[PDB]
Design a protein around this nucleic acid. Structure first.
Ligand SMILES: [Mg+2]
Length: 746
DNA sequence: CGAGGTAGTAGGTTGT
DNA sequence: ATACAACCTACTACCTCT
C-alpha cells in the first residue's frame, strides 16, 4: 500500500540521565509579567557567566555547569536549592532544549574553505548556514555585488521520548540579508531617503521606513531621544557599550539618520541600520540576482532531503551526549506512531449533461445551473486605449457562444453556455479619463443610470501615478447590487494577435469567474459522504493593528449546489470571534437556509481558519436549543511542516490528495506540484469537537478544495475557508448587508 | 485587475 | 539584544497554464 512520512531523522544513541545545578525563582516585589521576568532572568544570568546554558521548566531554572556569578534583580531573587540529576522519563521538555544546545555546539566549530566559520549559531532553534547547497551539492556561497547574502536557515525540533530514544524533526528555508550598513551607503552616495530598514543592534522592529537624513552628526548632544543624551553616548551608557566602544573619529562625525516608524519618528545611527531585503527591493536593485536565486529558493522534496541530510551529517557525533548521532535517512513510515498514510481518491465532479473527465472540459458538459436569460453587460474603457476593449468584448462574447476563439470553433468549446446580454445600444460602453479618484467614483455612478445593466466589464490600465480604479469601481458597484469583472489592459493587448492558443486558459478563468459572479454554478459532486446538510466556514482578516474583520461562507447542500457568503456588520479587534458576531452570522445564515429549504438543518460542519478558540459552550448551547448536531473543524494553513512521499529509497513530492491521519489530527496536501522544482505546502486539520469521523471530514475538505468555481485550478484552501479568505482580502469591495447568491469576490 | 500556487519580508493575536 | 510557542494577517517576486 501507499505511504509517506515527515522530514525527520532517527536518533541512534539512547540518552543518558545527567546532573544539573538547579535554581529556584522566588519573586520579591511586583513583576509586570511573570514570563518576561523569568526569561530576562535567564538571559541576563547566563550572560554574566561566560554565556553558559540555562534551561527553564515552569518557574525552575536548570543548568549543567555552575553559575558562580549571580546578579541581583530587585524584582526577583534567585535561590540556590542544591544539585540534582533529572530523570529523562518526566523531563522530556528540558532534555529537548539540552539537545538543541548540543547541536549548536557540534555545529559551531565547523569551518569551510573560507577561513571563517560556516554556520551562524546563536544557540536557538534557528541555525543559519552561510552557504546554500546547490542542486548538484556544490556548496557555493551566493552573494550579489551589493550585499544580498542568501543563506539556508535550519529550524531544529528534536523530540525526546519517555524512554531514552530521540527523534530529530527538521525544517529549512531561505533567508536574505545584507552586510552593508546604511553608513556604507552614505559613503558610497546611494540615496537612502525611503528604503525600509532593519535595526541590527536592537532587533527592535521592522517597518522602519526612513523619513529624512539629518544634518547633525551623531556626536552632537541630545541627538538620542532620551533627554540630554547624545546618540553615541546612548549606547555607551547602556549595557551594550560594545556597539560603539571603539569608534572612528569619522564615525563620531558621521551624520545621524531619522526615520519615521509606524507614524512615529525616531533617531537612529547609520552604522546600526541595514536595509530590509525583500524580493521587491532585490528585483529593483539587482534584477539578475533574483532570477538566479529563483530556482534555489523553491525546493523540491528530494532537494530538501539532500540539504537536510548534509546538515545532519555535519552534526555528526555528539561526544557530550552518550555518543548520540542521527540516522542518514528518513523513516519510511510513521506507522510506529498512530499515523496512517494514505491517498485520497479524486472526487467526481458533475457537469450539466453528466460526469466530466476533466475540469477543462466542463464546458462540453455544461454548467450545472444557469440564470435567467440575457442578463446584459457593458464595458468601461479608459480614454486612451478603447480599441483593445472592443477586441476583448467580442472575444468574451464569442466564447459564451459557439465561436470561442478568433475563428468560430466548437471543436473545444460548447455553444450557448450561459445566458448573457449582447452589449446593444442600451447600456453602452463609453470612455473615461484617469487621474481623479472622485471622477472614477463618478463614472461608476453614471453606470447606475442605465437600466438593468447586469454584470459589468471594465478595462484597467497597467500600473504609478495612475491610481488604478479597481478599488473605487469595485466599491461603487458594491454599494449597488452590481457585479464587476475588471480586466487587465495587457491581457487585452494579448487578444488582438491570433498567434497563440494560450488565450483559452485566460478565457476559462474569466468565464468561470463571470459565471461565478452571477448565480450560475459550473459543477457539483456526484458522490459525497452525505451525512451533512450544510457546510459553513469562516475566517478573520485584519488590515490594520487592532482591527479584525470576520467573514463567513456557506454551502446549503453537501454537493455544493449553491454557494452563499455573509460579510459581518462590524469589526472585532481580536482574533477570537465575538459572541455577538457569532449570533449575527448564524442568525442570518440559518434564517436564509430556513427560507430556501423550509427549516433549519439536521446537522452541520464548520471550518475555522485559525484556532477555533471560540467559546465552545456557546456553540453547544445555541445548537442544543435549536436541536442541531454540529462538528467543529479547524483548517490551519500557515504551518512550517512539510511532507514527503517515500518509495523505496526515493523521496518525491506527495501527489494531490496525500493524507496522514492520527486520531482527530491530520495533514493533507491539497495541491498538485510537479516533482521538478517545488514542494507542496500541506495544511493541518484538527477536530476539537465533532461527531463525523475523521476520514469523512478529510474527504469532504479535499473535495471542497477541488470544487473551486473561480478557476479550473483547484484552490489549495477548501472553498469554505478559501472564500472567507477572499472576502477578508477585499472586505470593503464586498456587499456586507446579507447573504447573496451571486459571488462578488472571485 | 485570467487563475492558481510556491517562496521571501514584515507584523500581529492567543494560551501555556 | 532577548518571552515563548503556535497560528494568523499583509505585500511582492516568480512561474505555469487540455
Ligand atoms: Mg474576480
Amino acid at each position: 500500500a501507499n505511504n509517506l512520512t515527515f522530514e525527520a531523522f532517527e536518533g541512534i544513541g539512547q540518552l543518558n540521565e545527567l546532573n544539573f545545578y538547579k535554581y529556584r525563582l522566588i519573586g520579591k516585589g511586583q513583576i509586570d509579567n511573570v514570563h518576561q521576568a523569568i526569561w530576562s532572568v535567564k538571559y541576563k544570568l547566563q550572560a554574566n557567566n561566560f554565556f553558559k546554558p540555562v534551561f527553564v521548566k515552569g518557574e525552575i531554572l536548570y543548568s549543567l555547569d555552575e553559575l558562580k556569578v549571580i546578579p541581583e534583580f530587585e524584582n526577583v531573587e534567585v535561590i540556590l536549592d542544591g544539585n540534582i540529576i533529572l530523570s529523562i522519563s518526566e523531563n522530556t521538555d528540558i532534555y529537548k532544549d539540552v539537545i538543541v544546545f548540543y547541536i549548536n555546539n557540534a555545529l559551531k566549530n565547523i569551518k569551510d574553505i573560507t577561513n571563517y566559520r560556516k554556520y551562524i549559531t546563536k544557540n536557538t532553534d534557528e541555525i543559519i548556514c552561510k552557504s546554500i547547497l546547490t542542486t548538484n551539492l556544490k556548496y557555493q556561497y551566493m552573494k550579489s555585488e551589493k550585499g544580498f547574502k542568501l543563506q539556508r536557515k535550519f529550524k531544529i525540533s528534536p523530540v525526546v521520548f519517555r524512554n531514552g530514544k530521540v527523534i530529530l524533526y527538521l525544517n529549512c528555508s531561505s533567508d536574505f540579508s545584507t552586510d552593508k550598513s546604511i553608513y556604507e551607503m552614505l559613503n558610497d552616495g546611494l540615496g537612502v531617503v525611503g528604503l525600509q530598514v532593519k535595526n541590527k543592534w536592537t532587533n527592535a522592529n521592522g517597518n522602519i521606513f526612513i523619513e529624512k537624513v539629518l544634518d547633525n552628526t551623531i556626536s552632537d548632544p541630545g541627538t538620542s531621544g532620551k533627554l540630554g543624551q547624545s546618540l553615541i553616548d546612548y549606547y555607551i551608557n547602556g549595557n551594550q557599550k560594545y556597539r560603539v566602544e571603539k569608534f572612528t573619529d569619522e564615525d563620531k562625525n558621521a551624520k545621524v539618520i531619522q526615520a519615521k516608524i509606524k507614524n512615529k519618528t525616531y533617531n537612529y545611527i547609520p552604522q546600526a541600520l541595514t536595509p530590509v531585503i525583500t524580493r521587491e527591493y532585490l528585483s529593483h536593485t539587482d534584477k539578475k540576482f533574483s532570477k538566479q536565486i529563483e530556482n534555489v529558493i523553491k525546493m523540491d522534496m528530494n532537494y530538501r532531503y539532500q540539504t537536510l541530510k548534509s546538515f545532519v551529517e555535519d552534526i555528526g557525533v555528539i561526544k557530550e551526549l552518550n555518543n548520540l548521532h542521527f540516522k542518514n535517512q528518513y523513516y519510511t513510515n510513521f506507522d510506529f506512531m498512530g499515523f496512517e498514510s494514505g491517498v485520497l481518491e479524486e472526487p467526481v465532479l458533475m457537469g450539466a449533461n453528466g460526469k466530466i473527465k476533466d475540469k477543462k472540459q466542463i464546458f462540453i458538459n455544461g454548467f450545472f445551473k444557469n440564470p435567467k436569460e440575457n442578463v446584459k453587460f457593458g464595458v468601461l474603457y479608459p480614454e486612451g486605449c478603447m480599441e483593445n476593449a472592443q477586441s476583448i468584448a467580442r472575444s468574451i462574447l464569442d466564447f459564451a457562444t459557439a465561436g470561442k476563439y478568433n475563428k468560430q470553433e466548437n471543436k473545444y468549446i460548447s455553444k450557448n453556455l450561459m445566458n448573457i446580454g449582447f452589449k446593444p445600444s442600451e447600456c453602452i460602453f463609453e470612455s473615461y479619463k484617469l487621474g481623479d479618484i472622485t471622477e472614477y467614483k463618478a463614472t461608476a455612478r453614471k453606470l447606475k443610470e442605465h437600466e438593468k445593466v447586469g454584470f459589468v466589464i471594465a478595462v484597467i490600465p497597467d500600473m504609478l501615478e495612475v491610481e488604478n480604479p479597481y478599488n473605487p469601481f469595485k466599491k461603487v458597484w458594491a454599494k449597488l447590487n452590481i457585479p464587476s469583472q475588471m480586466i487587465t489592459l495587457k491581457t487585452t493587448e494579448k487578444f488582438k494577435n491570433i498567434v497563440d492558443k494560450s488565450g483559452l486558459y485566460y478565457l476559462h478563468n474569466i468565464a468561470l469567474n463571470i459565471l461565478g459572479k452571477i448565480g450560475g454554478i459550473p459543477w457539483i459532486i456526484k458522490d459525497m459522504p452525505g451525512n451533512i446538510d450544510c457546510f459553513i466556514g469562516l475566517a478573520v482578516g485584519t488590515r490594520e493593528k487592532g482591527i479584525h474583520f470576520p467573514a463567513c461562507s456557506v454551502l446549503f447542500d453537501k454537493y455544493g449546489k449553491l454557494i452563499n457568503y455573509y460579510k459581518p456588520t462590524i469589526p472585532q479587534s481580536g482574533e477570537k470571534i465575538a459572541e455577538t458576531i457569532l449570533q449575527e452570522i448564524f442568525d442570518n445564515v440559518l434564517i436564509s437556509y430556513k427560507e430556501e429549504n423550509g427549516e433549519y438543518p439536521k446537522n452541520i460542519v464548520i471550518h475555522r481558519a485559525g484556532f477555533s478558540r471560540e467559546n465552545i459552550d456557546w456553540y453547544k448551547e445555541y445548537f442544543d436549543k435549536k436541536g442541531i448536531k454540529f462538528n467543529i473543524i479547524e483548517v490551519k494553513k500557515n504551518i512550517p511542516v512539510k511532507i514527503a512521499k517515500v518509495v523505496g529509497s526515493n523521496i518525491c513530492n506527495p501527489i494531490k490528495g496525500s493524507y496522514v491521519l492520527k486520531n482527530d489530527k491530520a495533514f493533507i496536501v491539497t495541491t498538485d506540484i510537479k516533482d521538478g522544482v517545488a514542494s507542496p505546502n500541506p495544511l493541518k486539520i484538527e477536530k476539537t469537537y465533532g461527531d463525523v469521523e475523521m476520514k469523512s471530514i478529510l474527504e469532504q475538505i479535499y473535495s471542497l478544495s477541488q470544487i473551486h468555481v473561480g478557476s479550473t485550478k483547484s484552490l489549495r484552501l477548501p472553498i469554505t475557508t478559501g472564500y472567507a479568505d477572499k472576502i477578508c482580502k477585499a472586505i470593503e469591495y464586498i456587499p456586507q448587508g446579507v447573504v447573496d447568491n451571486r459571488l462578488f469576490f472571485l
